[PDB]
Amino acid sequence: LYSLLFLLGLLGNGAVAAVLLSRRTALSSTDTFLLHLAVADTLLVLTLPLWAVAGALFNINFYAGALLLACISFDRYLNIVHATQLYRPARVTLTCLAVWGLCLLFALPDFIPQVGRTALRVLQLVAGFLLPLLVMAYCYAHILAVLLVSRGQRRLRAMRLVVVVVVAFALCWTPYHLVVLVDILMDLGALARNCGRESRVDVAKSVTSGLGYMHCCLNPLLYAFVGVKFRERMWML
């Protein structure tokens, strides 16, 4: 089953990368961020055979996932909540370098310590899953509120899609960071170590890593294939 996901990830990810990269003109901010995410997930799925330098690139891609997804949400909030003050393609390459740049800052130790790895885990939990999740929650809650006061036939479908995206992200990311937090507290002295539970926690690491792989493989299906614009390009190319 793991090998199937490997091809599924590359296949779907490549289509997203190819469709957007074949555009002959400028790409909107949402389009630019989606392209970065497709590349980010593309690298991670390449790791599958080995995991099932490798670790270092693994971390970079994982954070790229949430942060890029976090970046997508903020632009949607800006475009849909304050649509009157932001009427106008705005280049956003600056932030993409930062998000990829912030992964580099954290990714150095992987190429290169008890306290060092403790700080690594602390930063990972603080700024990799928690803050992005809060950002997504706030932005999409305001988007839902604005749409509920809107008028049209697309509002309901937009609400459904937003809820689906948020729920999928939560249910696919929480199980890994929960185990990471449990292990963090165990190391800090808030819990007790035992032979069986350590192996169970390693298996939990494995299972939640597979779940994250599933999310990375599903990213094309929930952010690209559901949009009207993307399908038109796919039908064109």
Author numbering: 59 to 110, 126 to 161, 165 to 188, 208 to 332
Text from the published report:
In addition, we also purified CXCR3 in the presence of CXCL10 and reconstituted its complex with G-protein followed by cryo-EM structure determination at 3.3 Å. However, the density for CXCL10 was not observed and therefore, this structure is referred to as the Apo-state. However, some of the regions of the receptor such as the ECL1, ECL2, and extracellular portions of TM1-3 in the Apo-state, and the extracellular region of TM1 in the VUF11418-bound structure were not resolved well. Interestingly superimposition of the Apo-CXCR3 structure with the VUF10661/11418-bound CXCR3 structures reveals an RMSD of <1 Å across the main-chain Cα atoms. A comparison of the Apo-state CXCR3 structure with the inactive state and VUF-bound structures reveals that Phe1824.56 in the Apo-state undergoes a rotation of 135° and points toward the ligand binding pocket, and this rotameric conformation is stabilized by Asn1323.33 and Gln2195.42. In addition, Gln2195.42 makes an ionic contact with Tyr2716.51 and further locks the receptor in the active-like conformation. However, it is not possible to discern at this point whether these features represent receptor activation due to constitutive activity or reflect the stabilization of an active conformation by CXCL10, which has subsequently dissociated from the receptor. Still, there are clear differences in the orthosteric binding pocket, in terms of the positioning of the extracellular side of the transmembrane helices and the conformation of CXCL10-interacting residues. In addition, the side chains of several CXCL10-interacting residues are not well resolved in the Apo-CXCR3 structure, which further corroborates our interpretation regarding the absence of CXCL10 in the orthosteric binding pocket.
